[PDB]
Amino acid sequence: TKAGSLTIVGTGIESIGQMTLQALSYIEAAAKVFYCVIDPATEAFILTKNKNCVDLYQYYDNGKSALNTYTQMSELMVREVRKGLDVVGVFYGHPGVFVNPSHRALAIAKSEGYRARMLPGVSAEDCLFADLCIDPSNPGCLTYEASDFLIRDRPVSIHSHLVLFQVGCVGIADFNFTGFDNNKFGVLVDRLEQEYGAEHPVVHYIAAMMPHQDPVTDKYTVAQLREPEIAKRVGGVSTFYIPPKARKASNLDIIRRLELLPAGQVPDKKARIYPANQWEPDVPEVEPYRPSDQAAIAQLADHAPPEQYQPLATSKAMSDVMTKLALDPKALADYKADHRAFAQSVPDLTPQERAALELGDSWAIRCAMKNMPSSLLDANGFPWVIV
């Protein structure tokens, strides 16, 4: 209703490639773009996509508090929203993951009654999972800012993943163009030694920022982090991953109340699904091809899709319109204003496809796009993860 909007989007971590299709489309559509990114290829790429961009990075300065910079960054965006423009703010990675000015600007915009939305992006933690070959679900994940971790004495779990952002700037309030002197780093190492022990592994992680670079995935002991040559390697794009120390056992009361037991059984805490976490100290080898695995693979020769499976059965015209709604913010806005009007103007849709667009309900769109078998409907069927 009110003129003016703020859409905050991400670029991902690795230059250009980790930007989402929707982030790109919003950058292109914006009246004005404000950006804070940390590699020039991504900056150059953004400038090719919109003629009215402002680099927010110029609002940092030596001995200028980060908070004054962030107040300024968010005010530059919100000023343009107040003038009635469709504004896009761009921050590297996920624009809401360890970022101050995005949240400020959106909350101000929202409080003054403008449309305000954050679009998710690929974070450094997303890259971490991908590059270190770990899954937050197994065995759970604790994520902290390193200074907050120390100052608020945040709990660790030795049975779960621990991820620490900003380990290169422990206790730092003021910006500096030649980087952080991280001489309170030893305080973090003290905490890690107390929680995990001197010989426990810490993985120093830096996601590749350019498409041809390898990630840094260097394992050190907690004690090695005290060596000057090693502590020097930790910088402003460094994250630590600390693997679990032990496997947590199962709670017999919950096992009973969930009915996961037929008489006596033995699914051990150390009996793991392949593959095991390679960073975790003293983890045994797990066999990828056990007899049960071999038997499942043997069944592939006789495989047919089951009766209840729903094959895709759509059309070029329907696929085109669903793609357009995802990749054209203008088309989406029109559809959102008037389902019926929009749906009538779409060429080459079948009566079912048109009807389904008119309603906009998930089931109608699903039936138009998937053949639902008879065996299924005599009862929206989803995959999960076993941990």
Place this chain on the structure above:
Amino acid sequence: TKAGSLTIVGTGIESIGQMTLQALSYIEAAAKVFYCVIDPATEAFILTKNKNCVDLYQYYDNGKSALNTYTQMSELMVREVRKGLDVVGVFYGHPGVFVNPSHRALAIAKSEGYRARMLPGVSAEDCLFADLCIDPSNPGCLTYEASDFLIRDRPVSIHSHLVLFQVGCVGIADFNFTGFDNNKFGVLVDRLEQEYGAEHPVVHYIAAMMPHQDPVTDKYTVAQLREPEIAKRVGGVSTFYIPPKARKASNLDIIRRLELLPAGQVPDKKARIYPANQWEPDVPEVEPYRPSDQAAIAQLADHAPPEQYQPLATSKAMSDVMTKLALDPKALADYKADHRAFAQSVPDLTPQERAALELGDSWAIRCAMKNMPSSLLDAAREASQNGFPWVIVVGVI
């Protein structure tokens, strides 16, 4: 040297738009594509981008263990890798976040000496942060699978964010096409009552899967989750967000070791940085425009970029090649195989740009694309000494 590769990529959560540019380019470049996605528009989109796709979802069945299905899905991918093909597996969201077969397939491919890589994507947790307007950094974030949370008695922190995936299938071991009766949901609700109290908020979160839909961001008390009408709403794509019950105070020893109070002390721990988390119970109003904020804004009129600021100073030819390397997997592989030959054949690069690309060093590329000041070039010679952005979470910093 060994022929064949496995690249596993995500599609994000919201249909089509949340796919990354690199996920798309790998899908297009693949010899064979294997996918597991949960909306038809994303599925249809994938099929327009590659001619040799296989839907992995057909390997689920009633009375077939999930583990057997996952062994099968991974083996379909790795079989094609062993034949020397560039294979791409595709999973919705981030392909390594609450997903079994991706990790298995990659670990096998890696162990047998094939090129193997996972490309990250946008997870449901990423969507959650964006839609619920929260930052994992403030005040820290614990993320669990709901059944594992109960069975292993995983610890909560009442001072940090808690995110629980798979709240719609508590204790469920068998696959079935017609969904699941979440009959053991009450076991989760008891644990949440124990940890947080009956009146503590729980946010039922479902990210929009189609671009036109709105997310579900429905706040309930723990007690309200016992009502059948409310419990019925929690399904297979439901995640719970539980906000902090209290703010944690600061440690005086660390405040002293980090030298964060020259004057002694201030009088507050809940004098928050704007904005506050609007899901927290009894969160006070935070002032966005304090006198210090107004003073910072007043300085915008006279602002000039500092001397040390590095303006972009590149060329179309350089921007084009860096974009190509990011969006064309074949160009990237060629470049990686021989930096110098690749660099020689790029048209219209300046001598510095060519030299930078020949080396491949990130510092050299940066210096070819930005007008660097002497002081920053001085510091780099005698780890990367650049000012990078950082978040402030602790008010006293």
